[PDB]
Write an enzyme that holds these catalytic residues in place. Structure first.
Site, short mmCIF file in Angstrom:
data_model
loop_
_atom_site.label_atom_id
_atom_site.label_comp_id
_atom_site.label_asym_id
_atom_site.label_seq_id
_atom_site.Cartn_x
_atom_site.Cartn_y
_atom_site.Cartn_z
N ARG A 178 0.88 -1.17 0.00
CA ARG A 178 0.00 0.00 0.00
C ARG A 178 0.92 1.22 0.00
NH1 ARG A 178 -5.14 -1.48 2.73
NH2 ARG A 178 -5.03 -3.70 3.33
N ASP A 243 -2.79 -8.28 4.03
CA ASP A 243 -3.85 -7.69 3.20
C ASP A 243 -5.04 -8.59 2.87
OD1 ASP A 243 -1.86 -5.25 1.29
OD2 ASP A 243 -2.49 -5.30 3.38
N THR A 244 -4.79 -9.87 2.63
CA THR A 244 -5.87 -10.80 2.35
C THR A 244 -6.83 -10.83 3.54
OG1 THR A 244 -4.37 -12.54 3.12
CG2 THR A 244 -4.69 -12.29 0.73
N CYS A 349 -3.31 -21.86 -0.66
CA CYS A 349 -2.85 -21.07 0.49
C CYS A 349 -2.32 -21.87 1.68
CB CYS A 349 -3.96 -20.15 0.97
SG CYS A 349 -3.47 -19.04 2.31
N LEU A 350 -1.06 -21.64 2.04
CA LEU A 350 -0.46 -22.31 3.18
C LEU A 350 -1.05 -21.81 4.49
CD1 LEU A 350 3.17 -22.19 1.86
CD2 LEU A 350 2.01 -24.33 2.51
N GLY A 351 -1.61 -20.60 4.48
CA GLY A 351 -2.21 -20.05 5.68
C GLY A 351 -3.72 -20.21 5.78
C1 HEM Z 1 -8.62 -14.81 3.95
C2 HEM Z 1 -7.24 -14.91 3.88
C3 HEM Z 1 -6.45 -15.45 2.86
C4 HEM Z 1 -6.72 -15.64 1.52
C5 HEM Z 1 -8.03 -15.44 0.75
C6 HEM Z 1 -5.52 -16.12 0.90
C7 HEM Z 1 -5.41 -16.53 -0.44
C8 HEM Z 1 -4.29 -17.10 -1.06
C9 HEM Z 1 -4.28 -17.60 -2.42
C10 HEM Z 1 -5.44 -17.46 -3.39
C11 HEM Z 1 -3.06 -18.18 -2.63
C12 HEM Z 1 -2.61 -18.93 -3.89
C13 HEM Z 1 -2.15 -17.93 -4.96
C14 HEM Z 1 -1.68 -18.59 -6.25
O1 HEM Z 1 -2.02 -19.76 -6.50
O2 HEM Z 1 -0.95 -17.92 -7.02
C15 HEM Z 1 -2.31 -18.00 -1.40
C16 HEM Z 1 -1.02 -18.43 -1.18
C17 HEM Z 1 -0.29 -18.31 0.03
N1 HEM Z 1 -0.80 -17.75 1.18
FE1 HEM Z 1 -2.72 -17.16 1.54
N2 HEM Z 1 -4.50 -16.22 1.82
C18 HEM Z 1 -5.04 -15.84 3.01
C19 HEM Z 1 -4.35 -15.88 4.23
C20 HEM Z 1 -3.04 -16.28 4.43
C21 HEM Z 1 -2.35 -16.27 5.70
C22 HEM Z 1 -3.02 -16.00 7.05
C23 HEM Z 1 -1.07 -16.62 5.46
C24 HEM Z 1 0.04 -16.56 6.32
C25 HEM Z 1 0.13 -17.25 7.51
C26 HEM Z 1 -0.99 -16.91 4.04
C27 HEM Z 1 0.13 -17.42 3.42
C28 HEM Z 1 0.23 -17.83 2.09
C29 HEM Z 1 1.40 -18.42 1.49
C30 HEM Z 1 2.75 -18.57 2.21
C31 HEM Z 1 1.08 -18.73 0.22
C32 HEM Z 1 2.01 -19.31 -0.84
C33 HEM Z 1 1.66 -20.72 -1.28
C34 HEM Z 1 2.49 -21.21 -2.45
O3 HEM Z 1 2.90 -20.38 -3.30
O4 HEM Z 1 2.74 -22.42 -2.55
N3 HEM Z 1 -2.19 -16.69 3.45
N4 HEM Z 1 -3.09 -17.35 -0.47
#
Ligand code: HEM
Ligand SMILES: C[As](C)(=O)[O-]
Ligand SMILES: C[As](C)(=O)[O-]
EC number: 1.14.15.1
Length: 406
Positions: A178, A243-244, A349-351
């Site tokens: 941002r 941000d998500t 998503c890992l989270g």
């Molecule tokens: C409502 C909350 C969340 C949403 C909607 C969200 C959504 C996503 C999505 C759609 C991807 C896959 C993107 C792709 O395929 O290019 C992703 C990847 C990831 N997210 Fe989340 N996320 C959220 C929360 C979190 C949180 C809480 C963490 C951290 C603890 C996190 C960590 C990650 C990581 C490390 C990846 C990478 C996975 C990879 O590339 O193998 N996310 N997220």
């Protein structure tokens, strides 16, 4: 005219000029703005001349298929156009199987279900602390007062970092996602790495049980993970969960503020909160990135050229009427809540587990203390569209005499 000349291999009948960074009728709501791609006359796969020119899969079936087929759809740089992500270098975003496997497993060790369960009570404490501080005030700017502080404080807990470091750390992450013009993305990123490196080297020698220690002492290809690899994964473990969560919580609270029925439903049927979380995740989905064609490939009757970029909106799968009946309507009792809000395929998503817990805890603890709230009188909520769509500002109001400190 902001229009990129149509490539020879793209048939004119598949053209649909959609700007993911400024969609027409964004004023109707961002999910609604993206839903124009699902109107009856629009093909399953289209080409937009906006943002340099790229494909866009508009239906859940195609989006799921493309995300599963990493051999044809590479994650080398999911940002479209490529310049949208500048000097982004987080791990394991740009990796695909097999290289990706080891990093995901290590990351799952630090944010997986077992860790989330162990952190729940503390997450609940943080939520209650924030809500209780707001309760007597009768108003708040939700995004700034709860949505933003919640995830960053959760990271400090997860990563074993002191609360005093938030002003600096949060400033840097905000500078990255941002930007206000102070630092470039590369500069903000370098500053983030300058913060992480010392902590990583330290915990590599004298490890703890925190996320950074586990990552720092991980094994990759039969050898210790490097300082470079470790910082690049920690950076995403931090930024990926900010941000998500901030924007998703904002979309959800905006909806609840406008729908007394749904608030009342969760107050009288608390056991439905987990199910409600899943339905809100579907309706207020917010991520949209893509992949790159590794080779010339025929996909659903469409010729895709090597190097072409294809946007596979995670947001659209669950909004697809072919996946869910009356998709724009929220039903906490939906028997089959189909969506790809956290993505699909190898990069899921890992989270996701930590995210669901944050949402569920927020809904329970908020509805328990401030059951009756509304959008501030005279306020007009505006959404923003992009890789991670969101809410500009969410002013809420309530009568303090109608709340209950618990
Ligand atoms: C409502 C909350 C969340 C949403 C909607 C969200 C959504 C996503 C999505 C759609 C991807 C896959 C993107 C792709 O395929 O290019 C992703 C990847 C990831 N997210 Fe989340 N996320 C959220 C929360 C979190 C949180 C809480 C963490 C951290 C603890 C996190 C960590 C990650 C990581 C490390 C990846 C990478 C996975 C990879 O590339 O193998 N996310 N997220
Ligand atoms: C080319 As368009 C951003 O309309
Ligand atoms: C914005 As990419 C090269 O990751």
């Amino acid at each position: 005219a902001n229009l990129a000349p149509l490539p020879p291999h793209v048939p004119e009948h598949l053209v649909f000029d959609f700007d993911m960074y400024n969609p027409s009728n964004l004023s109707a709501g961002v999910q609604e703005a993206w839903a124009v791609l699902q109107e009856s006359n629009v093909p399953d796969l289209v080409w937009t001349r906006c943002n340099g020119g790229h494909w866009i899969a508009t239906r859940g079936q195609l989006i799921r298929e493309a995300y599963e087929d990493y051999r044809h759809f590479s994650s080398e740089c999911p940002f479209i156009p490529r310049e949208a992500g500048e000097a982004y270098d987080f791990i394991p975003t740009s990796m695909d199987p097999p290289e990706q496997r080891q990093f995901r497993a290590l990351a799952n060790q630090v944010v997986g279900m077992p860790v989330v369960d162990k952190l729940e009570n503390r997450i609940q404490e943080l939520a209650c602390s924030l809500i209780e501080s707001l309760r007597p005030q009768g108003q708040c700017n939700f995004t700034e007062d709860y949505a933003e502080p919640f995830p960053i404080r959760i990271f400090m807990l997860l990563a074993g970092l002191p609360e005093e470091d938030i002003p600096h750390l949060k400033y840097l992450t905000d500078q990255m996602t941002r930007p206000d013009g102070s630092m470039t993305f590369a500069e903000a990123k370098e500053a983030l790495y300058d913060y992480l490196i010392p902590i990583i080297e330290q915990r590599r020698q004298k490890p703890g049980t925190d996320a950074i220690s586990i990552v720092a002492n991980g094994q990759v290809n039969g050898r210790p993970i490097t300082s470079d690899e470790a910082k690049r994964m920690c950076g995403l473990l931090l930024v990926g969960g900010l941000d998500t969560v901030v924007n998703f919580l904002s979309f959800s609270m905006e909806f609840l503020a406008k729908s007394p029925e749904h608030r009342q439903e969760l107050i009288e049927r608390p056991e439905r909160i987990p199910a409600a979380c899943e339905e809100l995740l579907r309706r207020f989905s917010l991520v949209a990135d893509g992949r790159i064609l590794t080779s010339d490939y025929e996909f659903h009757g469409v010729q895709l050229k090597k190097g072409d970029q294809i946007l596979l909106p995670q947001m659209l799968s669950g909004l697809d009427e072919r996946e869910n009946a009356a998709p724009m309507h929220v039903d906490f009792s939906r028997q089959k809540v189909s969506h790809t809000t956290f993505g699909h395929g190898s990069h899921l998503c890992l989270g996701q587990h930590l995210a669901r817990r944050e949402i569920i805890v927020t809904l329970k603890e908020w509805l328990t203390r401030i059951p009756d709230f509304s959008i501030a009188p005279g306020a007009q909520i505006q959404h923003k569209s992009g890789i991670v769509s969101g809410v500009q500002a969410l002013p809420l109001v309530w009568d303090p005499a109608t709340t209950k400190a618990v």
